[PDB]
Structure formats: C-alpha cells, structure tokens
RNA sequence: CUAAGUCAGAAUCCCGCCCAGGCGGAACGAUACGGCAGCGCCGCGGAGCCUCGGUUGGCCUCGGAUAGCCGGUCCCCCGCCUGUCCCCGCCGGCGCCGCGCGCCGGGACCGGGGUCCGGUGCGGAGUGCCCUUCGUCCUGGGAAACGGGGCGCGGCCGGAGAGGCGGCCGCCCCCUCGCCCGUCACGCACCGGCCGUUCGUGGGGAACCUGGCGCUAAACCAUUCGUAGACGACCUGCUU
RNA sequence: GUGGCUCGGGGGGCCCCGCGGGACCGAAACCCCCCCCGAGUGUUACAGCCCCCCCGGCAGCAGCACUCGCCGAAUCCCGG
C-alpha cells in the first residue's frame, strides 16, 4: 500500500539507502518523526560536520550557493536526494513519492508505522559507541521549532495512550469471551490447531 | 491563521479599503456578513467560533483601522492593521477583544510618556540614483575619460 | 505424457479457460494427450471438457475413481462459434449478424449425467468437499505461489 | 474472483554500467527475496498491461483500450531474487517502476 | 538480567546451518565463538559450531569436563531431554509453524470456513459482554 | 579534568531584532439580467473526447536492549471538572432538598503512576502477524433472533498539526434471509483446451442535455493626485 | 570424601472447650537448629566425574541421509 516509516532510533544513511531503492521501484514511502533520527559518531563532531556545510555557500547569492535546509524533515529528504538521480525525469518523478514530516501530522497519526530493522541503532551500533540525535543537532544549527513540535508530541502521546487503554480493555473481553462460549466452538478451535494455528 | 470574526457594523471608511474604485463599484462588501449578528442562528454559529478560538488559538490579534474623516489629507481610505494583545490567559484576552470590538481606542490606553517606542514605516524615495549618491563611494579624479 | 503428480480422480485448478480458476475433477488422458476434465455441473457448471496438461495446476487432494467409462467423442465444429466465425457452410457472404447460432447437443447431456452418477457419491464422501469445488481459486495479499504448496 | 497472476515490478534493463543491453529486462517479483526460491517462477509467461488512445480488439470480447506486450521469464538474476525476462518486443522504457503481471499458467507442478 | 548461561552441560538449540531444528548438547568451550558440542540422541555429530548458530535452552545436563558419547547419551536420556523438550511451550511454536507450512490447499479451505464461523461467534458474544460491562459501570 | 558521567567558559559559531517573501500553504470579504441570461448549492438521467496508474484491507501506545510484555490485586497516596456524586453543616419550605454554598469531611469513582504476586518471553495478546471471503435455487439442523438494511431522521461528540471528517448515540419502516454444516435442483453457465480492467470506478479534466433551493459583480483601461516615478509600477480622488 | 569458612532456604515451644477459665492453632524473632540442602577456597586424593598413557584381544558397517576434515572416474551411469 503506502509505507509509513517510523524514524525513531534509525541511522541517517542506512535508512535513506533503503528508502532510495524503494522509491525508484515505485512504492510511495512516507517517513515520520525524523527529529528522532540518530547518527553515528560524536555530537560535537557532527555539529562540526554541519557547520562545515553552512560555510560552503558563495554567500550573497543563492544561485552560486547551495541551500542549507535546516528542519530535520528537509535534512533527511536532502540526504535521500543525493542517493537518487534527480537530473533525469524518473529522478524527479520518483523523489516526489517520498514525503518527509517532522513529528507526526494527523493524516498519518492513526496509521501503524513500520520500523526498518536493517538501519536501527540498537542493531547497527555497538553498545558503547556514541551517537547524535538529529533533533538537538538540527535545533542547534538554526531550527526554530524544537519547542513547538515538542509540546504537540506530548499532546499526541497522551491521546494515543487513551486509545491503547481502550484497545487493551477490548482484548480482555475477547480473551474472556472464549471462556464463555468455549462450550460451543469446540469443533472449530479443534481444526484450527490441527492445521497449526493457535498453539 | 485559524479563524476570523468581523464586527457587525463596519464604518464606511473601512469598506473603502477592500476596493479599487469607489466611484465605479456598487459597494456590496460584507453585506451578506452583517446578517450573522442579526438573526439568532448565526449567533449560535458565531459564539462557537469564539469558543474554539479560546481552546486552540495561542496568540490573538485585532484588526484596527484608523480614522480618516479627521486627518487633513486627500485620503478617504482607512488603513487596516493587525494589533496583538499581550496579557493574561487566552480566554480573558479574547473577552477583552470582544468587548473592545467596534469601539474607539485612544493613544493613551496603548502607550505612556517617556517610554521607548519603535517607528516603522517606508522611507522617503529619491528615485533611480547613481552609485555615488547610493553607496557614498569615492568620486574618481576629474580627468577620467568616461563617467567620473 | 503426464506429470508425476496427476492421477485419475485428482482435483485441479484450471488457469486459462472462460472460467479462470475453478476446481475440477480430472478423469483420464485422451488419445490426444489432453486431460479429460469435468467439474460436475451441480458444483461448478463445467461439462465434460478437454484441458491441456500445462495449463492446469495439480493439487494434493484426490478421490478414488471407478467411473472411467464412456469413451471419447470430443472435437470442434461441434460447439464452435458458428454464428460469427468462418464455418457456417464454409462460405463467404455477409454473416456475423445474419445468422446467429451455436451448436448444442443432446448426447453430451446424457453423457455428462451418466458420468457424475458414478462420481458424485464419491465426491460427497469427504465432508465439506462440494463447498471447496464451488468456490474459485484467487490469490490474495500474503499468498506467494512459490511458498504455498498445493 | 481475484487476480490469477502474481505481482512483479519492472526494475530496469540488463546493463553493464553504460552499455545498457536493452533486450533483457530485470523483474523483481513481489515476495521472492532470495535466489533458490526463484526456481518456481522461471519459465512462466508474463505480461505488461497498459492503456492507450485508439481501441484494439480483444481475443474473446469486444474492443477496448487495453494493449499488452507478452513475454517470458528466462533465468535467475543476482542473489536477492530478481529474474531476467525476454519480452517479445523490448519494453518501452516508460514502465521502469510500474506493474508487470507474472501469469501462473505455464506450469511445472 | 541474565538468567540463561552457557556452561558445560547446557542444551542449545541450533537455528542456522545444516543442523537447524535439532537440539544439541554443549560439551566444552574452545573460544569466544566456537563451542565443542554434540547430540547423541538428536542424530548429530561431535563437532564445533559457532555460538552464532545456537539459541540457548533452560535445560542442563551433567558432564565432568568432556567425555565420550557413551556418557553423554546416558545423562541425556536419564533426564529425558527428547520428551522434556517436546513438552515445553517453545517446541509447540516450532511445530505450529511446521504445520502451517504443510497446509494443502483443500485444507486451507477448511480453515477459511472454520475461521469464518469462529469469528462470528466471538463477535456476537463480545456484544453481549459489551452491554453488561457498560451496564455495570452505571 | 577523561576512559564512562558532570561544571564554568569567549570579539568565534548558531539563532533573535533588521532586510527581501518559493512553480509555498493560510483566513476572510465579495461573485456579473436593471436581460432575450450567466450562475453556485442538493436530486437524477443519456451520450462525446481524453489523462493515466492500480487489481482485499490492517483505525495509531510509550519505549528499552547488561531487558521488556500481559494480568488480578485486598495495599498505597495522588496529576483528575475548584479532583467529580451522596450527605453532617447556617436558613427557608432542623428526619428531606437547595431559590445560596463550602466537597473541612465519612463514603461512591471507568481510569493511570506506585505495591504485591500470578503467567508467558528466540516474543502466539506473533507484520514468521491479524481481519473480509468474489458460482445461482427447495427444506432441516447448529451460533441467532440485544440481529440486518434503508447517501433516514434528532442530539452527542471527537477532531484541528496539512480537523478538510470518523465515531457514538435516541427515534422511523420492514425482514427472521443473510454465517457453518446437510438433501434436492440450476440457465452444460459459448469461447469447441487456449491471450487484454477480475476491482479501488459513481477515478480526475473538459463540452454539450433533466428539477428545486436560491445569487446579483469585481479587476483593468481612459481620468485625477505626487505620500511614488526613466516608460511600466506605486500611494490616492470621482450623485450625496 | 573430609577439611576451616562465607552466603541463602524447611521450619522449630501448644492443646482442648459452646467472646468464656488466659494468648491471630498464628510464625513471631532482638535470634537459635542440625548427623539438612544448593555454591566459591586450598587441600591429599579415591575410580559412587573423569581424562590420558602403557600390556593382550572383540563382527562393525566405510570417505556415511549421524550432512566431523580428501582427491578423483575404462574406478561412471541413470532421471528431470
């Protein structure tokens, strides 16, 4: 259908190198919560490796200089553009399938979001190596919405818990409903675990 | 911008603003909007608008236009401006604006004396000027066989 | 030739006919190397019918068979479209709306009814089976025709 | 009834790095994600279905807008489970990410 | 915190390689990664195989330091690993994925109807359990 | 003073104020008879070009990895609508209530953090996953009779981050069939063995044809001003 | 096995009568128990853990579907 990748605990490059292939293959990928995307290495080191990109602009022009997009949505969407062709016409008709957001907008709020274990930090980084949150790195170099997004996330995480509190309470009823009507689903549940289900 | 609410009576000074020809046009502006404050049904819709603005809107501003039937200009076109309100909780901030609506606001209620205020406005205009009058760069010597 | 997994009285999935995916009951191979196929009328509305070896998926679900009688007659120009196609008299005047007809038989009718007489009781022996033949095969999300075994 | 054809994704041509040999495609069948489970699909007639402007006849029915370019699946590719395919008329390079049906019916079971 | 150790006499489960699906007993440790193991009753040979390939299991045998197969078999079958393993909740999960992968097509149809009826039953009996739960909340 | 962790720190560096406002979104105002009309909203037809993809769905906890999950809790305080409902409390119509209150407080609270133990954990409360089942017709069993359907009505929500809608309810009409097993009967369902939309399609755009509810202009030029000006642009004035 | 030690676990005073003539028939420890159980030390050191080596003497399954480590095909062919 439409992937909705959760970008909390992922590494920048290894996640982009996976989305870049999917987009060129035609699937519409949408990423959320990029502001939690980790990176390898120090933090003082990577801030130097971004304040080494703000310099690379022939300053008083935007023509003879590049664009230093700062919001973490654009930082990741830029480091994907590197991994695709974009001078072609399948390059620009692919890049506009990937859609990158900060936090979680309401359309993708009520959607199950799939992690990508190939790039996950707890898998691809040793337990002792250090790492740098994209949020603090981006908020340091001029992002102006470290707080506005943060309060909104507090609003959502509670509004999700209300749903889950409801979701847990239901499954107890279905779990209990089996014990009530076990006397007359006997010959079905038998054939389900003959075939390997429910064991 | 979240929502906008306009007063029931709009001074015909202000209606001048949204137009480009007061001699040509039939001046039908906001006429269909003066009704929502006239019948009951709109009030039930309108008061909902203000209540929503209480719960959601963080910073509230008010659209205040100037007098022109007093200034000795050639102008009859009022200037509309957003003015922010800085104060307590949003609900009382809104209940303040819904109260001040449609009324006059003197200068004293806004400022004081011996305060510091900041003057913002479009500079004068001297037109297409060379580089010596623009950036105050040095003039070359007198003997240059081209523009000096 | 026949593949190693097709035996008389096995269930198939037909893949390229008018009905693209019914289950059927295979009887035997003709002299002309095409499977004799019948998913009996009262379960699929499929009559005695030839089908090719290659176009048919074999399934691991068989029923014992002893109604293999009634040798073949099948051919074409027998149900061939003789309303639109060339053969109506092998002639080339204006047709294709002038005379509409498809040949329809009586011997096939008794032939079909005299075959499932031996078959249908054997089908009913396994419970829920006639339900399985009525429904039609169709892939779905999470169905990988390389990973599921028939 | 649902689809009787497996899904697949056209993914390019067989290309060295610059000499793009434009007569042998590279499918990626949805689901097969490693070689040695690709011995089931190879040899089955595939198809590329697309619409157009002018009508064309349809075997078995009335003319419609649909046109198809038939093909076949020849041999395995790489290790991730892609399969080369030899189309009767080389694919138009417009569909570089779009659908390519892999029918089932040339069968080996 | 850790509650399953690797020591002389453990019984590990092989997951990757030619010997997947068979339990194996750990005899001796040679280095970080390889471990000299053996299965007498699981038809496995005495050979090293890397620690990456084993999933640990709760059970423990008794070995001195390292022994022949004559004395690994005895302590293996005096504790009935071949049956204790089959009684665990773990094994029943492996045989569940090993039946689901055996489903013949007509069989799968049986489940389609069976799982169809079994879900209507719960759907109604939840609603009757849904009404009372709200009713007793008031 | 460093390996893990933590502090002070500067004309630097980053942001703020300040200057422009993206093939970037916003909110609101008005919407062309003084017509032989052009029109916007709800109902429903019939053609005539086109642009393309697709070919069940998955409506959501947070979060860790040298740990997590699910449950019942008599135990414990509370973030709770001044922490909500009954009530001793002053007075009236003080056993009862608030035409006023304050819940000091006993007690009632669906919840959640906490306690405690009881279960799983190469995770079955499993994305190795879950939900929906796509040939037509008698009767005769099983769950069912708190079931279904009608772009139904009236209210509640609930939603603003790119709610742009989804859900809950009260009432209206008729059915007892819709699901699982049976028996019986079927238009030989046309291809005779054989190809391309089986569906999300009431998809998007545009031009001509069917009612009711209802709408009646703004921009630019010509003119004027000089708060602007090389010509454009800009700031302004013109039947009360 | 024994040896000195350290750590936890089983509990250990008691009946009977329809609040009474007196104590939750409850473990309660400021603590006590063993010839009790499960582990870390050093110890001589058995064959109720073994391992290796040396005398004499058993058919065992063949380069193994017990998938521990070779090279091959007048010692080589069959089926798809």
PDB file of N, CA, C and O in Angstrom, chain A residues 95-116:
ATOM      1  N   UNK A  95      11.414  11.117  -6.673  1.00  0.00           N
ATOM      2  CA  UNK A  95      11.650  11.863  -5.447  1.00  0.00           C
ATOM      3  C   UNK A  95      10.359  12.416  -4.869  1.00  0.00           C
ATOM      4  O   UNK A  95      10.220  12.514  -3.647  1.00  0.00           O
ATOM      5  N   UNK A  96       9.389  12.752  -5.717  1.00  0.00           N
ATOM      6  CA  UNK A  96       8.130  13.277  -5.212  1.00  0.00           C
ATOM      7  C   UNK A  96       7.155  12.183  -4.820  1.00  0.00           C
ATOM      8  O   UNK A  96       5.950  12.443  -4.744  1.00  0.00           O
ATOM      9  N   UNK A  97       7.638  10.966  -4.590  1.00  0.00           N
ATOM     10  CA  UNK A  97       6.844   9.978  -3.878  1.00  0.00           C
ATOM     11  C   UNK A  97       7.198   9.970  -2.400  1.00  0.00           C
ATOM     12  O   UNK A  97       6.312   9.862  -1.548  1.00  0.00           O
ATOM     13  N   UNK A  98       8.480  10.096  -2.085  1.00  0.00           N
ATOM     14  CA  UNK A  98       8.904  10.235  -0.702  1.00  0.00           C
ATOM     15  C   UNK A  98       8.365  11.531  -0.120  1.00  0.00           C
ATOM     16  O   UNK A  98       8.536  12.604  -0.703  1.00  0.00           O
ATOM     17  N   UNK A  99       7.712  11.432   1.034  1.00  0.00           N
ATOM     18  CA  UNK A  99       7.182  12.588   1.744  1.00  0.00           C
ATOM     19  C   UNK A  99       7.689  12.525   3.174  1.00  0.00           C
ATOM     20  O   UNK A  99       7.531  11.502   3.843  1.00  0.00           O
ATOM     21  N   UNK A 100       8.295  13.608   3.637  1.00  0.00           N
ATOM     22  CA  UNK A 100       9.036  13.618   4.890  1.00  0.00           C
ATOM     23  C   UNK A 100       8.409  14.647   5.815  1.00  0.00           C
ATOM     24  O   UNK A 100       8.196  15.796   5.419  1.00  0.00           O
ATOM     25  N   UNK A 101       8.132  14.237   7.048  1.00  0.00           N
ATOM     26  CA  UNK A 101       7.461  15.077   8.025  1.00  0.00           C
ATOM     27  C   UNK A 101       8.239  15.099   9.329  1.00  0.00           C
ATOM     28  O   UNK A 101       9.027  14.198   9.621  1.00  0.00           O
ATOM     29  N   UNK A 102       7.999  16.141  10.112  1.00  0.00           N
ATOM     30  CA  UNK A 102       8.560  16.292  11.444  1.00  0.00           C
ATOM     31  C   UNK A 102       7.468  16.039  12.469  1.00  0.00           C
ATOM     32  O   UNK A 102       6.358  16.560  12.344  1.00  0.00           O
ATOM     33  N   UNK A 103       7.785  15.255  13.489  1.00  0.00           N
ATOM     34  CA  UNK A 103       6.656  14.862  14.288  1.00  0.00           C
ATOM     35  C   UNK A 103       5.761  13.950  13.475  1.00  0.00           C
ATOM     36  O   UNK A 103       6.211  13.224  12.590  1.00  0.00           O
ATOM     37  N   UNK A 104       4.470  13.992  13.770  1.00  0.00           N
ATOM     38  CA  UNK A 104       3.515  13.137  13.073  1.00  0.00           C
ATOM     39  C   UNK A 104       2.262  13.940  12.753  1.00  0.00           C
ATOM     40  O   UNK A 104       1.484  14.260  13.661  1.00  0.00           O
ATOM     41  N   UNK A 105       2.029  14.289  11.495  1.00  0.00           N
ATOM     42  CA  UNK A 105       0.824  15.024  11.136  1.00  0.00           C
ATOM     43  C   UNK A 105      -0.407  14.151  11.262  1.00  0.00           C
ATOM     44  O   UNK A 105      -0.309  12.918  11.211  1.00  0.00           O
ATOM     45  N   UNK A 106      -1.580  14.753  11.422  1.00  0.00           N
ATOM     46  CA  UNK A 106      -2.793  13.987  11.728  1.00  0.00           C
ATOM     47  C   UNK A 106      -3.134  12.933  10.684  1.00  0.00           C
ATOM     48  O   UNK A 106      -3.638  11.862  11.054  1.00  0.00           O
ATOM     49  N   UNK A 107      -2.925  13.176   9.381  1.00  0.00           N
ATOM     50  CA  UNK A 107      -3.272  12.112   8.421  1.00  0.00           C
ATOM     51  C   UNK A 107      -2.544  10.804   8.670  1.00  0.00           C
ATOM     52  O   UNK A 107      -3.133   9.736   8.482  1.00  0.00           O
ATOM     53  N   UNK A 108      -1.287  10.851   9.096  1.00  0.00           N
ATOM     54  CA  UNK A 108      -0.527   9.648   9.400  1.00  0.00           C
ATOM     55  C   UNK A 108      -0.489   9.333  10.887  1.00  0.00           C
ATOM     56  O   UNK A 108       0.238   8.427  11.300  1.00  0.00           O
ATOM     57  N   UNK A 109      -1.244  10.069  11.700  1.00  0.00           N
ATOM     58  CA  UNK A 109      -1.263   9.800  13.131  1.00  0.00           C
ATOM     59  C   UNK A 109      -1.910   8.455  13.422  1.00  0.00           C
ATOM     60  O   UNK A 109      -1.340   7.626  14.138  1.00  0.00           O
ATOM     61  N   UNK A 110      -3.091   8.213  12.867  1.00  0.00           N
ATOM     62  CA  UNK A 110      -3.814   6.965  13.104  1.00  0.00           C
ATOM     63  C   UNK A 110      -3.428   5.896  12.090  1.00  0.00           C
ATOM     64  O   UNK A 110      -4.282   5.294  11.444  1.00  0.00           O
ATOM     65  N   UNK A 111      -2.130   5.652  11.935  1.00  0.00           N
ATOM     66  CA  UNK A 111      -1.642   4.650  10.999  1.00  0.00           C
ATOM     67  C   UNK A 111      -0.530   3.854  11.657  1.00  0.00           C
ATOM     68  O   UNK A 111       0.373   4.439  12.260  1.00  0.00           O
ATOM     69  N   UNK A 112      -0.586   2.531  11.539  1.00  0.00           N
ATOM     70  CA  UNK A 112       0.527   1.717  12.003  1.00  0.00           C
ATOM     71  C   UNK A 112       1.773   2.056  11.204  1.00  0.00           C
ATOM     72  O   UNK A 112       1.722   2.163   9.978  1.00  0.00           O
ATOM     73  N   UNK A 113       2.893   2.224  11.899  1.00  0.00           N
ATOM     74  CA  UNK A 113       4.128   2.702  11.296  1.00  0.00           C
ATOM     75  C   UNK A 113       5.218   1.651  11.439  1.00  0.00           C
ATOM     76  O   UNK A 113       5.476   1.168  12.545  1.00  0.00           O
ATOM     77  N   UNK A 114       5.870   1.325  10.329  1.00  0.00           N
ATOM     78  CA  UNK A 114       6.776   0.187  10.255  1.00  0.00           C
ATOM     79  C   UNK A 114       8.218   0.648  10.423  1.00  0.00           C
ATOM     80  O   UNK A 114       8.673   1.542   9.707  1.00  0.00           O
ATOM     81  N   UNK A 115       8.933   0.031  11.360  1.00  0.00           N
ATOM     82  CA  UNK A 115      10.356   0.284  11.547  1.00  0.00           C
ATOM     83  C   UNK A 115      11.118  -0.419  10.437  1.00  0.00           C
ATOM     84  O   UNK A 115      10.547  -1.219   9.692  1.00  0.00           O
ATOM     85  N   UNK A 116      12.403  -0.121  10.311  1.00  0.00           N
ATOM     86  CA  UNK A 116      13.279  -0.768   9.346  1.00  0.00           C
ATOM     87  C   UNK A 116      14.486  -1.320  10.094  1.00  0.00           C
ATOM     88  O   UNK A 116      15.470  -0.613  10.313  1.00  0.00           O
TER      89      UNK A 116
END
